[PDB]
Amino acid sequence: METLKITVYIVVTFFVLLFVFGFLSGDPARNPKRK
Amino acid sequence: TITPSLKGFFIGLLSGAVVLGLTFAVLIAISQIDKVQ
Amino acid sequence: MEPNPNRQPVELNRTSLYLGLLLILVLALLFSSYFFN
Amino acid sequence: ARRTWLGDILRPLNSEYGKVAPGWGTTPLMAVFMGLFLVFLLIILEIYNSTLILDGVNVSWKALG
Amino acid sequence: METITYVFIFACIIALFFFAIFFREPPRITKK
Amino acid sequence: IAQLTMIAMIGIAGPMIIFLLAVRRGNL
Amino acid sequence: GTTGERPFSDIITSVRYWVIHSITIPALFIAGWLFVSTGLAYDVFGTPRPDSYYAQEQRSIPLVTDRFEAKQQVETFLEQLK
Amino acid sequence: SANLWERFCNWVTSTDNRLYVGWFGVIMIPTLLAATICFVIAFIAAPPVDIDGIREPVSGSLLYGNNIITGAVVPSSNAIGLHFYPIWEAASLDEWLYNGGPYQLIIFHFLLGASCYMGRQWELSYRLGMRPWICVAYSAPLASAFAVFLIYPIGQGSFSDGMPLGISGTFNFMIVFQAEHNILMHPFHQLGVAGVFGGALFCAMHGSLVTSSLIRETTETESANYGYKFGQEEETYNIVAAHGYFGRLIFQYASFNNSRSLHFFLAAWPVVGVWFTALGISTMAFNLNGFNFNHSVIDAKGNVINTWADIINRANLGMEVMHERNAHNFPLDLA
Amino acid sequence: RIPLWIVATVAGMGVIVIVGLFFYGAYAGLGSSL
Amino acid sequence: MEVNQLGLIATALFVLVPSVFLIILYVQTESQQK
Amino acid sequence: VSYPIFTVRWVAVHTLAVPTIFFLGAIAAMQFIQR
Amino acid sequence: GWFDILDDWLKRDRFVFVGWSGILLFPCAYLALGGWLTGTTFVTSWYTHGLASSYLEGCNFLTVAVSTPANSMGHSLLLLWGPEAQGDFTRWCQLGGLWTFIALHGAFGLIGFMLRQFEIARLVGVRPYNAIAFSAPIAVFVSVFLIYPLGQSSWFFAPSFGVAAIFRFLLFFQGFHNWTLNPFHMMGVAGVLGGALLCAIHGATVENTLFQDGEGASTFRAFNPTQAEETYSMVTANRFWSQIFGIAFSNKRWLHFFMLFVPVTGLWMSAIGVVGLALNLRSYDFISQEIRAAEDPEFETFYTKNLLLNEGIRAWMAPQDQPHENFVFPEEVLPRGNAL
Ligand SMILES: CCCCCCCCCCCCCCCCCC(=O)OC[C@H](CO[C@@H]1O[C@@H](CO[C@H]2O[C@@H](CO)[C@H](O)[C@H](O)[C@H]2O)[C@H](O)[C@H](O)[C@@H]1O)OC(=O)CCCCCCCCCCCCCCCCC
Ligand code: CLA
Ligand SMILES: C=Cc1c(C)c2cc3nc(c4c5[nH]c(cc6nc(cc1[nH]2)C(C)=C6CC)c(C)c5C(=O)[C@@H]4C(=O)OC)[C@@H](CCC(=O)OC/C=C(\C)CCC[C@H](C)CCC[C@H](C)CCCC(C)C)[C@@H]3C
Ligand SMILES: CC(C)=CCC/C(C)=C/CC/C(C)=C/CC/C(C)=C/CC/C(C)=C/CC/C(C)=C/CC/C(C)=C/CC/C(C)=C/CC/C(C)=C/CC1=CC(=O)C(C)=C(C)C1=O
Ligand SMILES: CC1=C(/C=C/C(C)=C/C=C/C(C)=C/C=C/C=C(C)/C=C/C=C(C)/C=C/C2=C(C)CCCC2(C)C)C(C)(C)CCC1
Ligand SMILES: CC1=C(/C=C/C(C)=C/C=C/C(C)=C/C=C/C=C(C)/C=C/C=C(C)/C=C/C2=C(C)CCCC2(C)C)C(C)(C)CCC1
Ligand SMILES: [Cl-]
Ligand SMILES: [Fe+2]
Incomplete structure (x- = not known):
């Protein structure tokens, strides 16, 4: 039960990092023309 | 025979025809005053 | 007998099948509660 | 086609297909019964609705026996 | 008996969903 | 009592400061 | 894009228009005003005046209870100074 | 490898995926699978929930006597109020299912994902070179789920007052709402029905x-x-x-x-109308309710002359006086 | 010719006035509560 | 519980019958040459 | 062009236009009734 | 022949197209709108519902209304010159003659209007799907303002014309018919709610999937009133939704027919449900639920909860909502929870 908390926390961090480090990766660039 | 409500029916049946009348009168008339082709 | 000349073929595309079934199933999800009442 | 006994005997009744009267044919005469029917219904309607009462006509389960 | 019937239909709608999204008629352009 | 007197003036004021411009025709 | 009617725009701008309606519009207004202010409206529509819902004591409502003798029943309700 | 992460970002963002898993998607896809999976299990097998914190469990799942129309996922306890109740906050699941834990796990993940769903409706439009704003149309229905699932509860002080997740449970939310806020008599709801009626109208x-x-x-x-x-x-x-x-x-x-x-116009109308309806629920979440014309028109003596507004109040009192039978101990309903 | 923009802003204020008279009537008329 | 005895068969035929209908068509369409 | 005056459009416009003002006048007056 | 001349005139293209239909539409449509606007400000509902219902009495745009006739009247057409009013006008007003007036007139007015669509369609040479669609609103008006009360004791239980006066119609239906639990009302809303979605969703899909046909930002001017190319990328729209929702249109002809169908079918269903509420053949309860609730006092669903809300609505409203019943419910008989 104290474990599940830990796991859940880890799991949410992963995705939230994947998210920030994502738009950070020069997202404006990704699109049809002007970039 | 011809009871109060029967008289009223006529009053409405008559007051109705009139409206249809003046309406088709006016209409049939103004219609025949312009429509050239 | 002469092959009747008034007949045409019948059709139901895949999308229609889907739209159809979606309707049948959900109606069933909507009315089953009242059928079991 | 395929004629048949009954078929011939009935042949006349179905043949005058597109046959129409000319112009405004019976129209006007028709437009009168039509108006008569319209008034007839309004009466029997208004009688059932007790809007047009008529001594002799009692619109209830009564007037029965 | 009722529960089973309710879940079944639900399970059937989700199956439909799948087939509808992944097994539609590919939508073809101009020459259709 | 009736300070509607106020509103009224400050009210026709807004449209005025553009109307006078419609007269002196310019910069609208 | 057009029909016989004279383009509203032109009319709502014609000094003739206002010369006519500056008279007509307020006319209609002052009329309806008087319709209410003269108490006439109350009689044209049998609508109760602030002092005519109940009789002084009564706290009951003048509910019409039978169709045919309704008008008659209503008249009596006006009787108890209602 | 042009660079794993470099690649990953190219896939995620790829516009060649059958379903566009976007950046927002990376948050969406998981939260939405949790919300959905927990719901379906709850709705089917969850046990009774002491929604009103008065130890009077309301069972709302199929296996416990409900049918599709009545069944629902019941809101967290009132004993809990606005407190966070993650599974790891309970001595056991038995305790968590009794205080309506599933409800929060669901509303939070759903609201989270449904937002990203909006964030995505933008992203794909970008990767495809089309104008944005579609996601702004979807802001209306979302802004409603939010109002009904979070704003109202924050405002009222408890998640137990949020709209239940079920057919009948929703009618409950409505009937009671009306009694405590007289919503039908509120400008925002009216604008709401204009938008919905209108929408359907125009749609036709x-x-x-x-x-x-x-x-x-x-x-x-x-x-x-x-x-x-x-x-x-x-x-x-x-x-x-x-x-x-x-x-x-x-x-x-x-x-x-x-x-x-x-x-x-076709888009503007409904979206604008629903925006107001959502602001209505978000506004009546702080007790600024509909117009109260009770006993307005009174006669020459002082007697109260009823209007339809009053006939509406009686129907409201019936709801007030009967909802939550055993939950009140005092005169005024301030909660 | 009377400039349109004036027909409007005049007919406009004219409505805010009548519709505003109604709103005042709400705290005085019979529709009052006093 | 205390439900209707015919509810099950009413729901079953309500789903089967029309579904079977559509399906018969779709497949006969689907298999029409050219 | 040589536009006419009394037209069908005119009739309509007045059937709604005339009564309205008459009502707005009536109502405006009610704002003063009391008890 | 005069007829064709009468025709000629009518079907003449004016600002406000008249047409044969107009001979029915305008007379009625105006009378209906007129009667409402009249009662709203002048006629009262005292002799009828013991209620103030007009501006003249103090009601505001929300509380005003043209209330139904007494329950004594029954289903009487209440003609100005009928047994009730007896030619008298003021009495007519006080007996709620203005209701059957607005009702019946507006009714014909909806017939005339649909006919119009049909007539104008024909002239302009377009398909009549605008008329088919309008069947939906007719059904609603017909079933709700006519069929319904025709099944009840009288016109008194039909919805009174007014804003608030309609809200009580809603509350009533919940409380007495438990209407929200009706399969048909649900379909109804699924359609109106779902129809207001297609509306919004399609609109936005178009505005944000447009081609550039101008150099301005305000792309409204960039439109070709004279056909030619599609003004928005139907092909792009397809791919968008196909990737965000999984499903997406791809046949504007169907996408638009669908938009007619959804909300018209919805309203048709909501009508049938009411045609049934006329006979009181409602969808009030679930028997299996009631039976378990009787034997077992700890069984509680959001359904049972609701039914109690109904009991309260009925008990606390019935008195001033059905005056003709001279109801007297002693304080001790009134259902109420604790404290409240
Ligand atoms: C979707 C497409 C997009 C289009 C959108 C278009 C934009 C729409 C903008 C909507 C904004 C609505 C805002 C309403 C503001 C109300 C103002 C107010 O604070 O006003 C409050 C006052 C209240 O009046 C008084 O209210 C009460 C005041 O009493 C209190 O006050 C004291 C006296 O001051 C006393 O001491 C008393 O004891 C105490 O109780 C009493 O009842 C009084 O008797 C009296 O009635 O005025 C009144 O409300 C009386 C007048 C009522 C009319 C209101 C109608 C509103 C209609 C909503 C619009 C939506 C319609 C949708 C249709 C769409 C069609 C397509
Ligand atoms: C043309 C459109 C039109 C239509 C269809 C209607 C329809 C209606 N009106 Mg409205 N009305 C209209 C225009 C119209 N009105 C206008 C312009 C006005 C303003 C003047 C009114 C003012 C009005 C009032 C004041 C009232 C109505 C009422 C009514 C309703 C019933 C009345 C009735 O019984 O008529 C009966 C129908 C007829 C008279 C038609 C007869 C037609 C035939 C062909 C003529 C035959 C005549 C001949 C003399 C008979 C021979 C038979 C012999 C045995 C005697 C009905 C729904 C009443 C109502 O709403 O009640 C609640 C009511 O009180 N109307
Ligand atoms: C309550 C909401 C609602 C309203 C107010 C409404 C209104 C209208 N819809 C119309 C059309 C349509 N509506 C359609 C589908 C829909 N309409 C819907 C919902 C609504 N539609 C829905 C949900 C749908 C989808 C099924 C279609 C497909 C059309 C049209 O083609 C038509 C149109 O032209 O589009 C813009 C217009 C017809 C005008 C007319 O007939 O004049 C002539 C008749 C008159 C004036 C008689 C009115 C008589 C009525 C019965 C009496 C009303 C009584 C008082 C006058 C009103 C005040 C009472 C209130 C306070 C309660 C009208 C503006
Ligand atoms: C564990 C268990 C059992 C769980 C149970 C959970 C539970 C309680 C669920 C119960 C659900 C339930 C039974 C509800 C009942 C509701 C129901 C079935 C109602 C009855 C419906 C019915 C037959 C009544 C008739 C009314 C009717 C026709 C309404 C239908 C409305 C409807 C289907 C509309 C769909 C709208 C919609 C979302 C579609 C969007 C389509 C789309 C992607 C278009 C986007 C788009 C736009 C463009 O512009 C262009 C250009 C293109 C290209 C394009 O694509
Ligand atoms: C006086 C004073 C003062 C000040 C003041 C100010 C600063 C003011 C301002 C003002 C303003 C600033 C005003 C304004 C006004 C306005 C108005 C009054 C308007 C109106 C409008 C209208 C009416 C419109 C309309 C329309 C329509 C409806 C449609 C479309 C078009 C149009 C737009 C035309 C002081 C404190 C020192 C002190 C004391 C005195
Ligand atoms: C009944 C009747 C009749 C007749 C009558 C008529 C036909 C009438 C009409 C009337 C009318 C026809 C009226 C009108 C009125 C109106 C009004 C009174 C209005 C008002 C308005 C307002 C107030 C508005 C406002 C607004 C809006 C809505 C929106 C937003 C903005 C504003 C604010 C501007 C007869 C004899 C046959 C017989 C018996 C019965
Ligand atoms: Cl409750
Ligand atoms: Fe479109």
């Missing part, structure tokens, strides 16, 4: 006008639909004939001839 208008003014290209015994090929150059209906008819129904200047202005 457009739909018919267009469908009725389609250029003939089909047989007498052939689906009139085939008269259209995916990827056409020119239009499939006479928008000039459409306008011609509709302009005559009412009158010309009261009819659209500009397809772009038509479609803007």
Whole structure:
């Protein structure tokens, strides 16, 4: 039960990092023309 | 025979025809005053 | 007998099948509660 | 086609297909019964609705026996 | 008996969903 | 009592400061 | 894009228009005003005046209870100074 | 490898995926799978929930006597209020299912994902070179789920007052709401129904006008639909004939001839109306309710002359006086 | 010719006035509560 | 529980019958040459 | 052009236009009734 | 022949198209709108519902209304010159003659209008799907303002014309018919709610999937009133939704027919449900639920909860909502929870 908390926390961090480090990766660039 | 409500029916049946009348009168008339082709 | 000349073929595309079934199933999800009442 | 006994005997009744009267044919005469029917219904309607009462006509389960 | 019937239909709608999204008629352009 | 007197003036004021411009025709 | 009617725009701008309606519009207004202010409206529509819902004591409502003798029943309700 | 992460970002963002898992998607896909999976299990097998914190469990799942229409996922306990109740906050699941834990796990993940779903409706439009704003249309229905699932509870002080997740449970949310806020008599709800009624109305208008003014290209015994090929150059209906008819129904200047202005209106109306409806629930979440015209018109002596507004109050009192039978101990309902 | 923009802003204020008279009537008339 | 005895068969035929209908068509359409 | 005056459009416009003002006048007056 | 001359004139293209239909539409449509606007400001509902219902009495735009006739009247057409009013006008007003007036007139007015669509359609040479669609609103008006009360004791239980006066119609239906639990009302809303979605969703899909046909930002002017190319990328729209929702249109002819169908079918269903509420043949309860609730006092669903809300609505409203019943419910008989 104290474990599940830990796991859940880890799991949410992963995705939230994947998210920030994502738009950070020069997202404006990704699109049809002007970039 | 011809009871109060029967008289009223006529009053409405008559007051109705009139409206249809003046309406088709006016209409049939103004219609025949312009429509050239 | 002469092959009747008034007949045409019948059709139901895949999308229609889907739209159809979606309707049948959900109606069933909507009315089953009242059928079991 | 395929004629048949009954078929011939009935042949006349179905043949005058597109046959129409000319112009405004019976129209006007028709437009009168039509108006008569319209008034007839309004009466029997208004009688059932007790809007047009008529001594002799009692619109209830009564007037029965 | 009722529960089973309710879940079944639900399970059937989700199956439909799948087939509808992944097994539609590919939508073809101009020459259709 | 009736300070509607106020509103009224400050009210026709807004449209005025553009109307006078419609007269002196310019910069609208 | 057009029909016989004279383009509203032109009319709502014609000094003739206002010369006519500056008279007509307020006319209609002052009329309806008087319709209410003269108490006439109350009689044209049998609508109760602030002092005519109940009789002084009564706290009951003048509910019409039978169709045919309704008008008659209503008249009596006006009787108890209602 | 051009660089794993470099690649990953190219896939995620790839516009060649059957379903566009975007950046927002990376948050969406998981939260939505949790919300959905927990719900389905709850709705089917969860046990009774002490929604009102008064130890009077309300069972709302199929296996516990409910049918599709009655069944629902019940809101967290009132004993809990606005406190966070993650599974790891309970001595056991048995305790968690009794205090309505599943409810929070669901509303939070759903609201989270449904937002990203909006964030995605933008992203894909970007990767495809199309104008944004579609996601802004979806802001209305979302802003409602939010109002009904979070704002109202924050405002009222408890998640137990949020809308239940079920058919009948929703009617409950409505009937009670009306009693405590007299919503039907609130400008925002009215704007809401105008938008919804209107929407459906217009939806029918457009739909018919267009469908009725389609250029003939089909047989007498052939689906009139085939008269259209995916990827056409020119239009499939006479928008000039459409306008011609509709302009005559009412009158010309009261009819659209500009397809772009038509479609803007078509989108603007419902979205704007629902925005207000959502602001209504979010506003009555702080007790600024509908108009209260109770005993307004009174006669010459002081007697109270009823209006339909009063007949409405009686119906409301019935709801007030009967909801939450055993939950009240005092005179005023301040919660 | 009377400039349109004036026909409007005049007919406009004219409505805010009548519709505003109604709103005042709400705290005085019979529709009052006093 | 205390439900209707015919509810099950009413729901079953309500789903089967029309579904079977559509399906018969779709497949006969689907298999029409050219 | 040489536009006419009394037209069908005019009739309509007045059937709604005339009564309206008459009502707005009536109502405006009610704002002063009391008890 | 005069007829064709009468025709000629009528079907003449004016600002406000008249047409044969107009001979029915305008007379009625105006009378209906007129009667409402009249009662709203002048006629009262005292002799009828013991209620103030007009501006003249103090009601505001929300509380005003043209209330139904007494329950004594029954289903009487209440003609100005009928047994009730007896030619008298003021009495007519006080007996709620203005209701059957607005009702019956507006009724014909909806017939005339649909006919109009049909007539104008024909002239302009377009398909009548605008008329088919309008069947939906007719059904609603017909079933709700006519069929319904025709099944009840009288016109008194039909919805009174007014804003608030309609809200009580809603509350009533919940409380007495438990209407929200009706399969048909649900379909109803699924359609109106779902219809207001297609509306919004399609609109936005178009505005944000447009081609550039101008150099301005305000892309409204960039539109070709004269057909030619599709003004928005139907091909792009397809791919968008196909990737965000999984499903997406791809046949504007169907996408638009669908938009007619959804909300018209919805309203048709909501009508049938009411045609049934006329006979009181409602969808009030679930028997299996009631039976378990009787034997077992700890069984509680959001359904049972609701039914109690109804009991309260009925008990606390019935008195001033059905005056003709001279109801007297002693304080001790009134259902109430604790404290409240
Ligand atoms: C979707 C498409 C997009 C289009 C959108 C278009 C934009 C729409 C903008 C909507 C904004 C609505 C805002 C309403 C503000 C109300 C103002 C107010 O604070 O006003 C409050 C006052 C209240 O009046 C008084 O209210 C009460 C005051 O009493 C209190 O006050 C004291 C006296 O001051 C006393 O001491 C008393 O004891 C105490 O109780 C009493 O009842 C009084 O008798 C009296 O009635 O005025 C009144 O409300 C009386 C007048 C009522 C009319 C209100 C109608 C509102 C209609 C909503 C609009 C939506 C309609 C949708 C249709 C769409 C069609 C397509
Ligand atoms: C043309 C459109 C039109 C239509 C269809 C209606 C329809 C209606 N009106 Mg409205 N009305 C209209 C225009 C119209 N009105 C206008 C313009 C006005 C303003 C003047 C009114 C003012 C009005 C009032 C004041 C009232 C109505 C009422 C009514 C309703 C019933 C009345 C009735 O019984 O008529 C009966 C129908 C007829 C008279 C038609 C007869 C037609 C035939 C062909 C003529 C035959 C005539 C001949 C003399 C008979 C020979 C038979 C012999 C045995 C005697 C009905 C729904 C009443 C109502 O609403 O009640 C609640 C009511 O009180 N109307
Ligand atoms: C309550 C909401 C609602 C309203 C107010 C409404 C209103 C309208 N819809 C129309 C059309 C349509 N509506 C359509 C589908 C829909 N409409 C819907 C919902 C609504 N539609 C829905 C949900 C749908 C989808 C099924 C279509 C497909 C059309 C049209 O083609 C038509 C149109 O032209 O589009 C813009 C217009 C017809 C005008 C007319 O007939 O004049 C002539 C008749 C008159 C004036 C008689 C009115 C008589 C009525 C019965 C009496 C009303 C009584 C008082 C006058 C009103 C005040 C009472 C209230 C306070 C309760 C009208 C503006
Ligand atoms: C564990 C268990 C059992 C769980 C149970 C959970 C539970 C309680 C669920 C119960 C659900 C339930 C039974 C509810 C009942 C509701 C119901 C079935 C109602 C009855 C419906 C019915 C037959 C009544 C008739 C009314 C009717 C026709 C309404 C239908 C409305 C409807 C289907 C509309 C769909 C709208 C919609 C979301 C579609 C969007 C389509 C789309 C992607 C278009 C986007 C788009 C736009 C463009 O512009 C262009 C250009 C293109 C190209 C394009 O694509
Ligand atoms: C006086 C004073 C003062 C000040 C003041 C100020 C600063 C002011 C301002 C003001 C303003 C600033 C005003 C304004 C006004 C306005 C108005 C009054 C308007 C109106 C409008 C209208 C009415 C409109 C309309 C319309 C329509 C409806 C449609 C479309 C078009 C149009 C737009 C035309 C002081 C404190 C020192 C002190 C004391 C005195
Ligand atoms: C009944 C009747 C009749 C007749 C009558 C009529 C036909 C009438 C009409 C009337 C009318 C026809 C009226 C009107 C009125 C109106 C009014 C009174 C209005 C008002 C308005 C307002 C107030 C508005 C406002 C607004 C809005 C809505 C929106 C937003 C903005 C504003 C604010 C501007 C007869 C004899 C046959 C017989 C018996 C019965
Ligand atoms: Cl409750
Ligand atoms: Fe469109």
